[PDB]
Amino acid sequence: ELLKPRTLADLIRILHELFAGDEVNVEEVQAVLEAYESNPAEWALYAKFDQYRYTRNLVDQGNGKFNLMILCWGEGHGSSIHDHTDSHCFLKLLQGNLKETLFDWPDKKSNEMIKKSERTLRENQCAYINDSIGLHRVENVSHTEPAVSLHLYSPPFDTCHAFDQRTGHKNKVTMTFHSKFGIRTP
Ligand SMILES: N[C@@H](CSOO)C(=O)O
Ligand SMILES: [Fe+2]
Numbered sequence: 003e004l005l006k007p008r009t010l011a012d013l014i015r016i017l018h019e020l021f022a023g024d025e026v027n028v029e030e031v032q033a034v035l036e037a038y039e040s041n042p043a044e045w046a047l048y049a050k051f052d053q054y055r056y057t058r059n060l061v062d063q064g065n066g067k068f069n070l071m072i073l074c075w076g077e078g079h080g081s082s083i084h085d086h087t088d089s090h091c092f093l094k095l096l097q098g099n100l101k102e103t104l105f106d107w108p109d110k111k112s113n114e115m116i117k118k119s120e121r122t123l124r125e126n127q128c129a130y131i132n133d134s135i136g137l138h139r140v141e142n143v144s145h146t147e148p149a150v151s152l153h154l155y156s157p158p159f160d161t162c163h164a165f166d167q168r169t170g171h172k173n174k175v176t177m178t179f180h181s182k183f184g185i186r187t188p
Contacts, residue, residue, distance in 0.1 A: 004030055017031070017062075021064060021068050028090060031092060036094065038126075040094075040096040047184040048061050048072040049150050050074060050181050055076075056075045057073065057180035057181070058179050059071055059182075060183065061152075064156070070152070071179070072150060072153070074148065075100065077142060078142065080142060082165065082175070083105055084139070087159035087162050090130070090154075092130050092155075093140070094127065094129075094152040095125050095128075095152075096126075097149060099123065099143075099147070101120060101123075105117060108169075109170070112169040115167045115170050
């Protein structure tokens with residue numbers, strides 16, 4: 003039974019229940035993420051920005067089944083075009099707006115990767131991606147407003163591929179945490 007999370011801590015407790023088993027009900031998880039109303043005081047501890055690129059801040063390590071983290075995007079900060087390593091990936095906006103651009107998996111032949119679609123993700127909305135859906139790029143295109151997002155990945159993963167938009171060629175990247183549980187982890 004899905005109830006509205008009252009706070010980030012409550013959301014975390016609910017997520018531990020939803021991931022207690024071996025499978026994932028994507029629509030239920032997205033619905034509970036969306037139902038949490040962002041409260042900046044509750045996540046300020048994790049919202050550690052860097053001037054030059056977006057940061058990844060671990061909030062909860064789940065139950066062996068997922069990682070929950072907060073990403074902090076300065077003005078103009080964005081990602082590579084990337085995949086999600088055979089995992090579910092939910093993104094909920096906590097502050098600001100992000101542009102998500104979708105791309106198909108490239109063919110083996112070298113070619114420009116042309117966007118398939120794009121949308122603006124707005125405060126409190128929860129999006130979902132997985133490799134079956136495609137690849138994406140996520141960007142804070144604002145010149146004036148930093149963005150903060152809450153991401154849930156299941157299973158957890160710490161490597162992915164970045165894709166060259168000009169050719170479709172991929173390179174393996176190791177992801178790092180800027181902080182864990184509020185503690186900077188240089
Ligand atoms: N997947 C990117 C963020 S966009 O992914 O919803 C990352 O975890 O760094
Ligand atoms: Fe992503």
